[PDB]
Design a protein around this nucleic acid. Structure first.
Ligand SMILES: Nc1ncnc2c1ncn2[C@@H]1O[C@H](COP(=O)(O)OP(=O)(O)NP(=O)(O)O)[C@@H](O)[C@H]1O
Ligand SMILES: Nc1ncnc2c1ncn2[C@@H]1O[C@H](COP(=O)(O)OP(=O)(O)NP(=O)(O)O)[C@@H](O)[C@H]1O
Ligand SMILES: Nc1ncnc2c1ncn2[C@@H]1O[C@H](COP(=O)(O)OP(=O)(O)NP(=O)(O)O)[C@@H](O)[C@H]1O
Lengths: 311, 311, 311
DNA sequence: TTTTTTTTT
DNA sequence: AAAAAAAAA
């Protein structure tokens, strides 16, 4: 939450600063987490300038060794937002954390985008209810976003729907490259008001249709790695929350399970957490954890009512 | 364990010594293992000064031929720390050695960072239990570090959790270049109190996202070689232990196994040891050795309980 | 095997001789193979003195034309040491020769250092078994040397392990320049007792991490050429044997094989022989010749048992 | 002369 | 069962 204007200090030119602004950098911490080469490659910058700049990023953000205790005390206050249902709150142990990346595993009709809606509204609850009190931006990439459902959840939690829709900064990606511009604009929007959550329904879906590899493929992974790193660039700074929804890739000639998310290893190593969603009978659905260091594997039911997620 | 102040002797200027301090050198042995050119390139140093300096490094640290017997007698006392479970102690033949580099091979959900936690606590056990009695520094590079698990292992071994967390010098890298500064600061911290273990979850992960080669690539390997050499600079001096966790790179158009760690040859040649981790059913996991001169290939189960590694 | 004291003759001053001793020269033949300029450049020497000196080197060592027959008769007695397994003895046609330089081509886990161990012990066998009866010096440069394995081979050949370890003059290089001092000390040790074999695991490995060229590079090759020439200076005098282990450099944008040893041409032209080692299934490994004038290309299996090299 | 990266259905 | 393609120091 530290604007570059604070770096408009110690002899840096304000127009040099406004050169820096155009990189999509807008906070001192973003400069602190910027690799030297990215900062060099942009034109009109001698490396010594970067010595000054990075010296200032160190000047504001400490980057040394830290006690495990202090880290624990800073871990004490992560919000971990409620999902809007109890059993998920038990699975996730209080729900999805801020400052992290999450994952929807499903085949279809698993209510993953549904959960994205309910989270999108429930971030706006007062913190006592677990909401981050943070405006929510929703990067849809299939156009499947439904305001009507947001009004339904608005009925569900008693807040006026108009207030809910006043936030929820919907955006509609098409090109794989477009998502990048949407990220830089996101970072541009982060400066003004503490947002709660980024959601992405199908970060991966564009990558199937565009990169018919291999390939390709080696380019596809090449792009995803940067995308996910940028998501870390946001999440490591402004908490809020990162949600990723993945289409599924069914194996052939496997054993006994015919699933696994597309995107290969690079997605898998990146996410702090992972989830998997099998349909039950009727509305009922089954969550099941993968790859969360915080938690033992667990599984649970939830119905998708008119209010969606519940019991 | 020999501070440069001992080299504040034989006519070397104390301010020349304090020029040397800034190189990240802080021990006489580090000077002894310093190549001539690195010592020259830093400003304010005539080569004759380096003749004096190196003459003193020889003056304190012997560097001649040695009997195999003597080397055996010095090999007799390496701690090789317990992993916190018996079957791993059998695989590794008493567990991970001090003075060496180690490797986690996994795809995801293989509990490699898990093992990093349990080691991070178990270094603090009394030596009879195999702990090096050495403070542990943990260079995380995905932010996935969990103090809570350290408290769990603290329950597991009966030591108070607060004492465990009093050490564990967590540090949070972002830039690829940042890891270097964290290394020099590490070497700076080595002087004060004998540490047990360096851990790095993902030394390699930054290198994917930053160097989208080739490339690049030729620069990426160029950087990794120095990084690993520095890890040798630490490990060859202060024992403790070096742990490396590697994301995986799945082959395409191979035969029959679709794995191999990224980083290419340069990582592979460097490590004294190597490990590989396939998930079993349930919590159970399978370790399997690569590239350990000390040991025949072997493999074994272990569950990841609430206490993590065990049976 | 001719000490400089024999040159303490024909009017040369004994203190001039003891000036010469400091050059790392310790044998008359070394003086005979010394280029005029190296001998001049060292201080306190007029060129006429070098006329005397070289005249004496000619006075003891003949350096004229020789019949091919005589050379054959002197080729008749080269030991070519057994490798400790039969099929390698067939490939190498009786095993590695004395008076020569050899090469390990591998990617990792190819058992090259393993073979270095078994050779290191098997030089000590009586000559009927092919051992040179020569003490062995082992210049490790990754610290990976394991006395335990030497004890294992000692079990393998029935000689007491303590006697084996009584030799095996282990030495631990770090700097690229350090290897040079280790060479001059080696030559200093050659005078006292006929050694069998020099081994070097990774002559090349330091050169990657230190010279991140190009460069550099032009300096790197500049150093390697001298290093290899010195290895010839030893090998051309005292037989014994020279073994070189090379890390691998995988090509990009090649055809169909993604290998070749680092060090470029200068290593390649130097070695009398060359070997290449592909892993087989299980312990089994595959040797394959390069660049041996003596031999047609061939290839063969060998297992790496608890006793290492065998069948 | 140096330097491997990538899964889909 | 069966599927390529990718530089720059
Ligand atoms: N009006 C409704 N009444 C009851 N249940 C509903 C209603 N609308 C949606 N649902 C539930 O929500 C699900 C919607 O599928 P969902 O999995 O949320 O979309 P998705 O996972 O994104 N699949 P995709 O089309 O690829 O985006 C339906 O299968 C129902 O279970
Ligand atoms: N609360 C818990 N209860 C039981 N098992 C757990 C719990 N938390 C973590 N685990 C186990 O630990 C694993 C964590 O994955 P792990 O492989 O340790 O992370 P990772 O290898 O670093 N993958 P990455 O996300 O790329 O860092 C889970 O898959 C579970 O097997
Ligand atoms: N105890 C053991 N039992 C069986 N086989 C073993 C044992 N110890 C070592 N080996 C074998 O020896 C190999 C050691 O690798 P090796 O190629 O000899 O080291 P290296 O080639 O020098 N690689 P590097 O680490 O870069 O030095 C293992 O891969 C095994 O095949």
């Amino acid at each position: 939450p530290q604007p570059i204007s604070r770096l408009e200090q110690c002899g840096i030119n304000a127009n040099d600063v406004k050169k820096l602004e155009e990189a999509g950098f807008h906070t001192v911490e973003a400069v602190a987490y910027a690799p030297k080469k990215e900062l060099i490659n942009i034109k009109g910058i001698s490396e010594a300038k970067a010595d000054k700049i990075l010296a200032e990023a160190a000047k504001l953000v400490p980057m040394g060794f830290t006690t495990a205790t202090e880290f624990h005390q800073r871990r004490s206050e992560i919000i971990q937002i409620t999902t809007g249902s109890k059993e998920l709150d038990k699975l996730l142990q209080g729900g999805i954390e801020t400052g992290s990346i999450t994952e929807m595993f499903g085949e279809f009709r698993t209510g993953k985008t549904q959960i994205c809606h309910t989270l999108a509204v429930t971030c706006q609850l007062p913190i006592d209810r677990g909401g981050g009190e943070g405006k929510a931006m929703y990067i849809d990439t299939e156009g499947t976003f439904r305001p009507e459902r947001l009004l339904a959840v608005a009925e569900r939690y008693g807040l006026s729907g108009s207030d809910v829709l006043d936030n929820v900064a919907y955006a509609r990606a098409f090109n794989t490259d477009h998502q990048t511009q949407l990220l830089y604009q996101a970072s541009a929007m982060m400066v003004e008001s503490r947002y709660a959550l980024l959601i992405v329904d199908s970060a991966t879906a564009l990558y199937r249709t565009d990169y018919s590899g291999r390939g390709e493929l080696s380019a596809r992974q090449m792009h995803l790695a940067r995308f996910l790193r940028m998501l870390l660039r946001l999440a490591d700074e402004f908490g809020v929350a990162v949600v990723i929804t993945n289409q599924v890739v069914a194996q052939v000639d496997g054993a006994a399970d015919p699933k696994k998310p597309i995107g290969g290893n690079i997605i898998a190593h990146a996410s702090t957490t992972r989830l998997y969603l099998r349909k039950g009978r009727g509305e009922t659905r089954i969550c099941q954890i993968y790859d969360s260091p915080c938690l033992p594997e667990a599984e649970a039911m939830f119905a998708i009512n008119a209010d969606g997620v519940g019991d």
